[PDB]
Amino acid sequence: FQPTYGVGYQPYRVVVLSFELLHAPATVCGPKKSTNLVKNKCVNFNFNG
Amino acid sequence: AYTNSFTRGVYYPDKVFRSSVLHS
Ligand SMILES: *[C@@H]1O[C@H](CO)[C@@H](O)[C@H](O)[C@H]1NC(C)=O
Sign (positive/negative) of CA torsion A45, A25, A29, A20? Predict the structure, then answer.
């Protein structure tokens, strides 16, 4: 790689974030806050997304 | 040498829970 090269021949850094979006316990999460739990009543819910 | 597997070598196919069900 030389800085004089045309755009297609210039270096690009590449990162691939691969997700194991499994039906399995989480270890990486988005910036969500968490509430107390509620029981025996009709609630909207979100567990791990 | 050889031996028979019989019914050995079944494993939980995914990390889900299920009950009372004939899953395929
Ligand atoms: C399978 O195992 C039996 C065990 O008695 C053996 O006699 C036979 O030769 C084996 N056959 C093959 C194809 O491995």
Answer: negative
- Neighbour-count burial for B1-24, b at 16+ CB within 10 Å, e otherwise: eeeeeeeeeeeeeeeeeeeeeeee
Distance B11 CA to ligand 1 centre (A): 25
The method of structure determination was: cryo-EM
Does the CA dihedral A33-A39-A40-A46 come out positive or negative?
positive
A22 and B16 within 8 Å at the Cβ level: the answer is: no
Give yes or no for B15 touching A (CB within 8 A): yes
- Which residues from A are below 8 Å from B15, CB to CB? 22-24
